[PDB]
Design a protein around this ligand. Structure first.
Ligand SMILES: Cc1ncc(COP(=O)(O)O)c(CNc2cccc(C(=O)O)c2)c1O
Ligand SMILES: Cc1ncc(COP(=O)(O)O)c(CNc2cccc(C(=O)O)c2)c1O
Lengths: 427, 427
């Protein structure tokens, strides 16, 4: 298993960029510190800069649900760029994607496109407060919604990995307006409102957690949150940047039947390009400039390329049996991995919902970030490296959910289980 | 002059998106309210969804310095997307653009790519504090650095144009750490440090303002800022999202010889795609995760398409006589506009530096936001509409700088002056 070229490039990268990466998790710090540099991706595969081919379960962290470099998406992009990649003015495509998104997401009646999940979260945090006139926000430990100053507290992703809580970087004051609670803990939340009457603008959370490993909400959790927010005139915000269009066309809110007031979207909506979006009830979205006083802008927001990619992606997802196929191959994968773990004598737990799955090296079950942290990271590290050598690319972190795509075939799944058996047989 | 199609689309957009736009300024609020929907752009022109053709001076707000849909850029993109548009893992292209950026920008020794100017400014605000251990920041009235909460104080760009106050939704606790001072007012700045000993993390500003109309720094302003920051161990941050690669390959810092500690980049660096970047002294950048404790991530950061576009764009800018040409045609434009104003009896002032210019309907001179506000917005509105009808597309705002590109020809300039003469002769 040669990684000579990846090592060269990554070594050089570290001299040009912090940690030699554009994003923390890519440094493979939580799993050995030896990242592989991709050269190209297609369908369900990724190719090393060394020629190694992998069955990819990261899907560029969510966007590639239709498979990498989907023929129809690239062709649509090839045609659209002939007209220019950015206008700085309205374009008909913004209207199209906007309509598609409104129809697809229950809670969304009005949408504002931005360039990333981070911008969307940042913006949604602002109207939550702008709309309610309150400053406190409730977020859960292990959840990740981008980074900022008064919000980066016990976040997920690169944060909920090395035990990193909040900051550094933000002032020891801003975060005071951000309340934290354990995921799946309704009581903790009620306690927070009880302790801050008329001060909570709302609760934001990943309807299904993907940034502290894969964690599904316990029965009644989402419903409880919806009920309590309504009770205290607080907003319920679903960060579906990762779950949106993956768990279901309408996301977790559609799947589990709970409608938030505001929703953030990203990844898939961009079909591979930088795109974010936030929308919700019209009355709330009305405060967004130029319609309302809350300012939020973006030079490249709604650019024709991103819109084209998003539109083509959503169109592909609307085809028959899309989510059934994802659930089918992912359950197979998820169950298979767990069986192999049982068979090989390794304590493990996990689950999957549509093309999103999780696998922890702990008997669990995992209901929150604290549970997730009991996972044997040492073993995960060896497992991840072992799978890599077997040609399987998994999230270089125990705290990141895995992803499946419409391009993954039954054979890819079997090849992955064969690889998993081989790897866990060792460990 | 028909705009039937634009009106239809914009009317529909307002029902789907706040103000029917992805970004405030595009709404034409302060210039007529009838924005025009672009269909395509090419070279120095833009085409209405109604068939109207315009000589574009907005350049999608900065990115299109090489001209819209530059052949070499679109071809590079066509080839790159065959390999996929996003990896979610390191790619060789990140190293390439990173190296190019480090070489181009004096202050930048290490870079972190992000997806927008907003993310770059947001991130840079965070290490300023992380690095100095101080919470207060100094920004100038009229300057715009994205919509990160801390920056929504006396903001320019869309806030100014829309006559919006400091945006709501941002906790007083957070805005309290943003200290403001009029641009070009060194004394006000010194007073701020004097009043907040050991509390100022640094000063951030547009080396050359473009978001409160075009405003150049008075002699000694930038130098003074550099000196005072050094004196109080505070950081000097240049937001060159707009000026970067436009005023000069190395930006204003290169042109005017003043080196900041951190620099934010955007627009042009993305060559038409969503891209942002922040870099500066290595010792400061070292705090950025995964190298340091300050967390900042981005799913699509450093994606291969953006990198490709940025690389090709920078390569074109490195060609001989690039900036000489921009200065040449823009001075011609700037002077011409002023002569016509004089000739037609309209009070006016403005200026240009490279492919960036400004034109105010006020005798001025304009040294700061307060001066800029003295402009006759009524007249500007009529002027802008009049030019539009003559086939010239200008920023729909008196408070936004205008832009020139390598695709604009001497003839385009003359046609613009001819149009200008015609329009101002009326008014
Ligand atoms: C639930 C959730 N909300 C917001 C974001 C942010 O969108 P952007 O990243 O486009 O600003 C996420 C991100 N999901 C995610 C997961 C793992 C790594 C990374 C990484 O930045 O390298 C990102 C997320 O998972
Ligand atoms: C100096 C400066 N700094 C930061 C930004 C922000 O980058 P993004 O806009 O990529 O988030 C700018 C923006 N410049 C600008 C000017 C006019 C329109 C718009 C608009 O959002 O519609 C943006 C800017 O001009």
């Amino acid at each position: 298993f040669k990684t000579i070229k990846s090592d060269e490039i990554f070594a050089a990268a570290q001299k040009l960029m912090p940690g030699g990466v554009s994003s923390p998790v890519r440094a493979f710090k939580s799993v050995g510190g030896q990242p592989i540099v991709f050269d190209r991706v297609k369908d369900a595969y990724a190719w090393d800069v060394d020629g190694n081919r992998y069955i990819d379960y990261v899907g560029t962290w969510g966007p590639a649900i239709c498979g990498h470099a989907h023929p129809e998406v690239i062709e649509a992009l090839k045609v659209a760029m002939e007209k220019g990649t950015s206008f700085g003015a309205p374009c008909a495509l913004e209207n199209v994607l906007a309509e598609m998104v409104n129809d697809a997401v229950p809670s969304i009646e009005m949408v504002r496109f931005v360039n990333s999940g981070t911008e969307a979260c940042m913006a949604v945090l602002r109207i939550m407060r702008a709309y309610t006139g309150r400053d406190k926000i409730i977020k859960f430990e292990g959840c990740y919604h981008g980074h900022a100053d008064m919000f980066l507290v016990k976040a997920g992703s690169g944060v909920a990995t090395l035990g990193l809580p909040s900051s550094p970087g933000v002032p020891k004051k801003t975060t005071a307006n951000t309340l934290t609670t354990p995921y799946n803990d309704l009581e903790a939340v009620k306690a927070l409102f009880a302790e801050n009457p008329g001060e909570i603008a709302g609760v934001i959370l990943e309807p299904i957690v993907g940034n502290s490993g894969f964690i599904v909400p316990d029965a009644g959790f989402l419903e409880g949150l919806r009920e309590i927010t309504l009770e205290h005139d607080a907003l319920l915000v679903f960060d579906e940047v990762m779950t949106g269009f993956r768990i279901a066309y309408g996301g977790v809110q559609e799947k589990f039947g709970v409608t938030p007031d505001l929703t953030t979207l990203g990844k898939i909506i961009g079909g591979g390009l930088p795109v974010g979006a936030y929308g919700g009830k019209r009355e709330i979205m009305q405060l967004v400039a130029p319609a309302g006083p809350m300012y939020q802008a973006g030079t490249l927001s709604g650019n024709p390329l991103a819109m084209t990619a998003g539109i083509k992606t959503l169109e592909l997802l609307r085809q028959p049996g899309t989510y059934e196929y994802l659930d089918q191959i992912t359950k197979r994968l998820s169950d298979g991995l767990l069986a192999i773990a049982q068979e090989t004598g390794h304590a493990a737990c996990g689950g999957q919902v549509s093309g999103m799955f999780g696998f922890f090296f702990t008997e669990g079950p995992v209901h929150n970030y604290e549970d997730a942290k009991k996972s044997d990271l040492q073993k995960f590290s060896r497992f991840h490296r072992g799978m890599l050598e077997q040609g399987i690319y998994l999230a270089p972190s125990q705290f990141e959910a895995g992803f499946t795509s419409l391009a993954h075939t039954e054979e890819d799944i079997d090849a992955t289980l064969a690889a998993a058996r081989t790897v866990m047989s060792a460990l």
